[PDB]
Design a protein around this ligand. Structure first.
Ligand SMILES: *[C@@H]1O[C@H](CO)[C@@H](O[C@@H]2O[C@H](CO)[C@@H](O)[C@H](O)[C@H]2NC(C)=O)[C@H](O)[C@H]1NC(C)=O
Ligand SMILES: *[C@@H]1O[C@H](CO)[C@@H](O[C@@H]2O[C@H](CO)[C@@H](O)[C@H](O)[C@H]2NC(C)=O)[C@H](O)[C@H]1NC(C)=O
Ligand SMILES: *[C@@H]1O[C@H](CO)[C@@H](O[C@@H]2O[C@H](CO)[C@@H](O)[C@H](O)[C@H]2NC(C)=O)[C@H](O)[C@H]1NC(C)=O
Ligand SMILES: *[C@@H]1O[C@H](CO)[C@@H](O[C@@H]2O[C@H](CO)[C@@H](O)[C@H](O)[C@H]2NC(C)=O)[C@H](O)[C@H]1NC(C)=O
Ligand code: NAG
Ligand code: NAG
Ligand code: NAG
Ligand code: NAG
Lengths: 175, 198, 137, 50, 50, 39
């Protein structure tokens, strides 16, 4: 707010446009990052109403319809652990292109495709497969026969549930 | 519009050079933007007072340009490293890394040159038409439990077959497709059917 | 909107892909009434796999696809002259420029390093074959 | 106006009132000879780095 | 008396912008790593150690 | 290229790049991946 200063400023050439251009490029890059990291699914998959996953319990990571936002339990824990516009010079902040609900929907679609189809949804179209057989397919990947899994299924299910409980407690306790 | 990536680099370089050239016609507070006029219009004791002001302005312009060039060069090197990695892995071999050499199952790649860049033509395998079946983790035959050596057990409603996981090609279940492991009172979801012995 | 206020476009209750991003999940596009519309972007087509504990889907046919990937390798090499740019053809100017020490050589050094790495990039990208092979006639 | 360069013959169309000549980036091509109506192109003397 | 303020504030803006550019490059590298991990660890099974 | 600024030419001409991308393409077609490890 000075007509005298803004006229002396024009004698310096174009130092005032390069900074704006650089900051605009930074903003575009920050949008592109979020676009390329999460948006990797063509469709929006969702889990079947009945959860028969061979004994595995994904209720801690699946979205919670009761909350106003469709975030999971662990996401709700995470969003409360990070703390922190008031300036009124030529300083402003812009809102991100994708709201938090859109990010939550992306991470829900990815997880609900992973549970039901496995890795077939990343190549072509999602192909359904029972989770107990998908885990055998994954065990064969690391050079362990599938009869090891099929004869111990309850043990692996219990260990996975206990590990999820431990990770939830660790996130809830330590800051 | 496919080659925006390579056009952006050229545009950025040209625009930076244009700005650097255009920075010469600025007073920076001096009487004139050309020092030849200053030297031919005033005595040295104030000619130098104008000259050093011009010097400071132009030196600041050069330093800004050099810093921007350094940052852009770092970014270009970061991209060239990825290009070299893709040439080493996608072209000179077959890559099992998912979504690294194109969407789908990677088969081969072919390199093509371009102005200030490279272009890859990834060839990929994609399944097309699907079906529905009814699987089972294993099969009891005589109290035993046969698991597939490689593949899945599928049924078309009445008969049970064993097929590979990526392409429908059913075959009769026999002792050359399955292996035995213990009894079958532990597996969950097992269904028992006859197993042929050659 | 939540990203400001928009005048000249009409709100639509539908949802499509994003054409011109605006912010806070709002995108604008040129429809066909021949106007400009501002909607809420949609992530994609809804889908729900028919998961069941004893059901499988096995492909019966394939298709071969070819995909292009474009990425840059090297930028344009350049070099600039200190005195010729700052004090072009002026002895009285070059006799004051050197009072600033060595601000000159440390710019040409950086530019030379950039220029050398610009050739190193192409060398490491393309030169990966010991011999020049030939296809049969 | 002072300046160094090499003055070649020109093939360009001025207007009866236009005297000087500018370029894409603020470069000068002085034309109107104060004794005749010749057109002249001012291009800088060659330079490089050894 | 205003030229000094102009010079100081211009230098402050230049410094802030340069630091922001470097930090943005670092964040871009981290985002590329995250995208690669999402493509490989999640959408498939990785044989790369650690 | 008029105010003390010059553009240097690249070390590898556009023909050598084409020769490289032709050698790679002719090796891949006729030898598979075996030309990257040994001979
Ligand atoms: C999956 O785990 C959740 C816990 O994360 C189970 O929900 C709990 O169930 C017990 C019943 O013994 C209740 O006392 C808890 O209050 C429940 N917790 C929450 C957060 O709802 C859920 O039952 C498990 N799923 C199955 C099928 O057992
Ligand atoms: C499931 O597949 C089996 C194997 O092909 C089918 O049995 C054959 O069916 C054809 C006609 O559909 C007959 O010509 C053959 O003689 C049958 N073979 C045997 C050994 O019986 C069976 O029909 C299929 N079931 C369904 C519901 O399509
Ligand atoms: C596998 O075959 C056996 C027969 O050899 C079936 O066992 C019978 O199951 C019924 C149902 O509980 C019992 O009433 C019979 O006494 C069982 N017979 C024997 C000899 O044990 C068994 O049901 C078959 N598997 C499945 C999944 O049905
Ligand atoms: C698998 O898909 C291919 C095409 O992707 C099918 O090939 C086509 O077959 C029809 C016959 O119904 C022909 O009219 C087309 O000309 C074929 N296209 C090509 C490109 O050859 C093929 O038939 C499918 N396989 C099966 C078993 O249905
Ligand atoms: C398999 O069954 C589901 C549910 O009945 C159906 O939606 C799907 O289209 C079927 N698959 C095919 C290939 O028809
Ligand atoms: C599979 O689900 C059905 C109900 O849809 C159930 O009756 C059956 O017991 C389940 N299979 C196993 C092995 O529990
Ligand atoms: C969208 O629909 C609601 C009711 O569902 C209605 O009140 C509103 O006016 C509609 N928006 C527009 C732009 O017509
Ligand atoms: C004076 O200038 C005019 C301009 O064209 C020219 O025709 C004439 O020859 C000049 N005379 C002398 C003596 O220089």
């Amino acid at each position: 707010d000075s007509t005298e200063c803004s006229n002396l400023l024009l004698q310096y050439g174009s130092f005032c446009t390069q900074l704006n251009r650089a900051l605009t490029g930074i903003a575009v890059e920050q949008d592109k990052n979020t676009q390329e990291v999460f948006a990797q699914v063509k469709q929006i998959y969702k889990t079947p109403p009945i959860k028969d996953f061979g004994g595995f319990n994904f209720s801690q990571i699946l979205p919670d319809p009761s909350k106003p936002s469709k975030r999971s339990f662990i996401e709700d824990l995470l969003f409360n652990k990070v703390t922190l516009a008031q300036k009124f010079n030529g300083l402003t902040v812009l809102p991100p292109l994708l709201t938090d609900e859109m990010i939550a929907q992306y991470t829900s679609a990815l997880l609900a495709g992973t549970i039901t189809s496995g890795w077939t949804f990343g190549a072509g179209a999602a192909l359904q497969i029972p989770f107990a057989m998908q885990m055998a397919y994954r065990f064969n990947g690391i050079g362990v026969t599938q009869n090891v899994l099929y004869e111990n299924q309850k043990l692996i299910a219990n260990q996975f549930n206990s590990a999820i409980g431990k990770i939830q407690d660790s996130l809830s306790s330590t800051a | 519009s496919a080659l925006g990536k390579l056009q952006d680099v050229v545009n950025q370089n040209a625009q930076a050079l244009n700005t650097l050239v255009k920075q010469l016609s600025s007073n920076f507070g001096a009487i004139s933007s050309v020092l030849n006029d200053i030297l031919s219009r005033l005595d040295p004791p104030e000619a130098e007072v104008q000259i050093d002001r011009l010097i400071t302005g132009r030196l600041q312009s050069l330093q800004t340009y050099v810093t921007q060039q350094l940052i852009r060069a770092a970014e270009i090197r970061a991209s060239a490293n990825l290009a070299a990695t893709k040439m080493s892995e996608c072209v000179l071999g077959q890559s099992k890394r998912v979504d690294f050499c194109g969407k789908g199952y990677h088969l081969m790649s072919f390199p093509q040159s371009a102005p200030h860049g490279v272009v890859f033509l990834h060839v990929t395998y994609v399944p097309a038409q699907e079906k529905n079946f009814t699987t089972a983790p294993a099969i009891c035959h005589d109290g035993k439990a046969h698991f597939p050596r490689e593949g899945v057990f599928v049924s078309n409603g009445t008969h049970w077959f064993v097929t590979q996981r990526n392409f429908y090609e059913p075959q009769i279940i026999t002792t050359d497709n399955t292996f035995v492991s213990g009894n079958c009172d532990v597996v969950i979801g097992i269904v028992n059917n006859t197993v042929y012995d050659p | 909107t939540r990203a400001g206020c928009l005048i000249g476009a009409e709100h639509v209750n539908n949802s499509y892909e994003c054409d011109i991003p605006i912010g806070a999940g709002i995108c604008a596009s040129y429809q066909t009434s021949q106007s400009i519309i501002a909607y809420t972007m949609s992530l994609g087509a809804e889908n729900s796999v028919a998961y069941s504990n004893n059901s499988i889907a096995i492909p019966t046919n394939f298709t071969i696809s070819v995909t292009t990937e474009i990425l840059p390798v090297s930028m344009t090499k350049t070099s600039v002259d200190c005195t010729m740019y700052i004090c072009g053809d002026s002895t009285e100017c070059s006799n004051l420029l050197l009072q600033y020490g060595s601000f000159c050589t440390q710019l040409n050094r950086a530019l030379t390093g950039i220029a050398v790495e610009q050739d190193k990039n192409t060398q490491e990208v393309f030169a990966q074959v010991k011999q020049i092979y030939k296809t049969p006639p | 106006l002072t300046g160094t360069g090499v003055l070649t013959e020109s093939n360009k169309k001025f207007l009866p009132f236009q005297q000087f000549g500018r370029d894409i980036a603020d470069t000068t091509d002085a034309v109107r000879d104060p004794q005749t109506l010749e057109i002249l192109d001012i291009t800088p003397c060659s330079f490089g780095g050894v």
